[PDB]
Design an enzyme around this catalytic site. Sequence first.
Site, mmCIF file in Angstrom:
data_model
loop_
_atom_site.group_PDB
_atom_site.id
_atom_site.type_symbol
_atom_site.label_atom_id
_atom_site.label_comp_id
_atom_site.label_asym_id
_atom_site.label_seq_id
_atom_site.Cartn_x
_atom_site.Cartn_y
_atom_site.Cartn_z
ATOM 1 C CD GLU A 5 -3.305 -7.131 4.000
ATOM 2 O OE1 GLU A 5 -3.367 -7.227 5.241
ATOM 3 O OE2 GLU A 5 -2.700 -6.204 3.428
ATOM 4 C CD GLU B 193 -2.775 -1.163 2.506
ATOM 5 O OE1 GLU B 193 -3.366 -0.089 2.736
ATOM 6 O OE2 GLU B 193 -2.933 -2.190 3.200
#
Lengths: 531, 530
Positions: free
Chosen positions: B264, B142
């Site tokens: 995820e 991220e």
Amino acid sequence: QTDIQSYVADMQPGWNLGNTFDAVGDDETAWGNPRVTRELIKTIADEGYKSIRIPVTWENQMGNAPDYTINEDFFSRVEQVIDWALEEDLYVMLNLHHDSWLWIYNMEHNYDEVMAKYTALWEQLSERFQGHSHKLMFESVNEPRFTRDWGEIQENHHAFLEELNTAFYHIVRESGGSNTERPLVLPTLETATSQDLLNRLHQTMKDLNDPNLIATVHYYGFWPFSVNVAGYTRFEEETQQDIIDTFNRVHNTFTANGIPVVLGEFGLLGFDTSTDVIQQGEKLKFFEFLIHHLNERDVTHMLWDNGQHLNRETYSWYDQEFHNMLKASWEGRSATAESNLIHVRDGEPIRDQDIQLHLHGNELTGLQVDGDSLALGEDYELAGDVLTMKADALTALMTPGELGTNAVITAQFNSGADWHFQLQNVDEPTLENTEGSTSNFAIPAHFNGDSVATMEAVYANGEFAGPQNWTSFKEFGYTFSPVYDKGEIVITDAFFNEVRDDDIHLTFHFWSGEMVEYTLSKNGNHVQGRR
Amino acid sequence: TDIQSYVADMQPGWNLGNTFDAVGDDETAWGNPRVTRELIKTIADEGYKSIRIPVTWENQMGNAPDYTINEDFFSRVEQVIDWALEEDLYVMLNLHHDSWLWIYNMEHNYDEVMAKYTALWEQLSERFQGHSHKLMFESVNEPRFTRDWGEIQENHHAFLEELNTAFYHIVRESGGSNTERPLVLPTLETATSQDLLNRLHQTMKDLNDPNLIATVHYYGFWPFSVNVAGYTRFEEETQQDIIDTFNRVHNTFTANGIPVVLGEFGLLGFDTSTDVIQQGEKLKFFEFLIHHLNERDVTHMLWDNGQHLNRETYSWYDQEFHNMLKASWEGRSATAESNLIHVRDGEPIRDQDIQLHLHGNELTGLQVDGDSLALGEDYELAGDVLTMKADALTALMTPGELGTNAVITAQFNSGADWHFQLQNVDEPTLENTEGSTSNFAIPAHFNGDSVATMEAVYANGEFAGPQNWTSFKEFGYTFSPVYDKGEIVITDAFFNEVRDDDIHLTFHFWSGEMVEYTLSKNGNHVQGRR
């Protein structure tokens, strides 16, 4: 002078038995104070105070409609403390305290209940203390407030408060006896000190057309200085001007036209966190200024002591320097200085050091270290009001390596309290890296004898981070607190709860002048700190 | 293609979270035990065929210019990876929380961050040079960088492309089994909006490689994922967010021959606790979500920080959850309007209707403690409305005992079994209290019920509490019902954002009922009344 002004003037000075009977709980000990001892009132008398304010919160010892009878043991304990205070020849001021916001708040939408419990309460009170001395006064309501429909305040609140004041008044006066001439203390709205409020209390008091009435106000200092926010770390001109304007309005509206004023509660707002939120010397200067101007305007002041100022278990003051400055300010002005600290770097050769005094109308007579007078010329010089500690004197009084307070230089004057300098041997403070949760984040620190004054929090783009977003300087205590005995700087959960996931630059301002930089990395509930 | 057979053969995936990825001295800093090889064995035999190993290296990297990784931590990562492939699993290795720890500072520390970056992926590629090719490299978790005026900007896209290209060329130049080693590359913040996906699109098209994989993360429609703004239901706004999100991922990437790994997923609110979202609504969310993931060939990897499988038992904390998950691996399962059936103890018992959602399947029977119950005499089915008969509920319940009396298991021709909790409820009661903001809890009698959300309004109608833009609380962070201690706590975080005033609270229960409460805050003290 009128009889009522001699009364209020004879109250000076006053003291609040706070966080006791006023605590919102099952008894007077809900908020950490012990039950009242007969020694407490006696020491409060022998420390120079001549009036005592007993705030009481009644909701949790009142019955049900329509009597709302007060519980007899709580009632008798209140009455016992008042009796004691009158054995000590003190003035006693009795109020309904935190009931203000507990239910009286609710009058716009619960009018007949609020005034039923109100009327009943003051009926019980007035009947109970009917045969008491005139050094017992009744105060209608502490810091009154009412429910915000559109916000505080307008219209409704003034009417409500006036109706409370006149109802209370007519009850006490209709009780007769010593309650006929018993002085009655009535408040502005939230006990605030703005002109409109003052003129409504003024018109209510004229309305009631009584010689034995007293006006009340509260004051806890210029807000940002009082809570150590927005960088107002020192007692500078803004606080002083706030005092001057506030009590000039109070004086012109009330004292000047023959109605005396009891400043029934004063202090610093930040002491609700800790007395460590304001630096020692600036606290002393604030209180000396305030008491000076109050004396100059015949305003009888009562200090708010929730238990943090006098140790009700030793019966001595937690901070004697503070109380010494108070009890000198009762009699007259005391000399102050730019600071109560003298900084000396452990690594630099020791040089003569200048210190700006504030004589406040007084003259310097000597300096003492550990009770022994110091040497003129060889230890110190005085040029006007700039005092100079000579190099040899500091070299002798200090220890190379020993960081922190090495000695205390006491400045004595022909009048007023002694001013005490803390001679600080300091190095440049350093921080360490750490990592932890928002719930338990503490920066390991080496204060090196120094003192944290304030902290700022800005994002890496320059926007003000943290709570009270309108300023870079965060609030002391609520957002961060230096714990010196454990060598760390805590960053509170309340701070992290108002910061975005980002990098935070903090800039710690020390009372030595130095500034330490630190950067935090915030993501979710985890934060890492680097130097 | 070989790459789509690879990514498709990863399905399904599981994240070994809050382990090697914890920011601390070792894998256990954030409460999980050290990894056991039984752990991964169990994760393999529960049906998963790929495992994601996130790792944060900052606190075990050396100093310039080598930045060598500490050998025992390194040997531990390599040990876990080796094991995971003894179980014939796929492994994806990434840079984890370094994302915000130092990679963030790329605008103001370019040569340092890319020195540590280049060094790290050199250690990496050199260490796993001779390993199997079902071990994958994921560039950066991220990614984010410092906001000059905010996210997102011109600079950030360039930065992320430079990391992707640097890592790509490092591994490619390492040679060996790293020559056709597949490479996983993320969009920025693993977000799922069009522009970003197209920046990653031109990035891989630039890189002109057959063994590339696009990764994105997704934790659900924000307000439902954390139980805010009254979104207590799994209703169509959430579902539409799923559909739009993965329609964009499928149009932009899968349709053009590059597969997408949702590396995820979950709902954000479970970072507090799995109790912030209601059980049945959680199940419906996951079944819908996994259904569409399968429909667009999106390989899923569950985010498990230790919250879903008890790494001590080697069994799932919530078996119903895992049962619904891996049934949705194969296909859709029927759901319902609710997970529980409410019946008050004081009123006479009635036949009760309950709306199902036959997601393409049919009901075949019902079970109570493993035994099928009589049709007609106990229950009817009209179209998609199921009806519990009065006599069946009367027999199944106990007058007075409030709470879960029984669990009715709906069996279907396909999909997971759905379990309904039969709740005998009374009207919940509160009591008066007094206390500080730091530990304020309302004594409560839930009477078998369950709190869904809370409102906080000032006596003037203004929205109180944090996120002032709505009356509806955030679950957990502002208030939490603790049933084991019969009270409702209001946290420091709530009171720290409310003025000294009277606050009306409105507790929403999953039974439909609503109970009111009023607080009076003055300073650090608060009064609670019914």
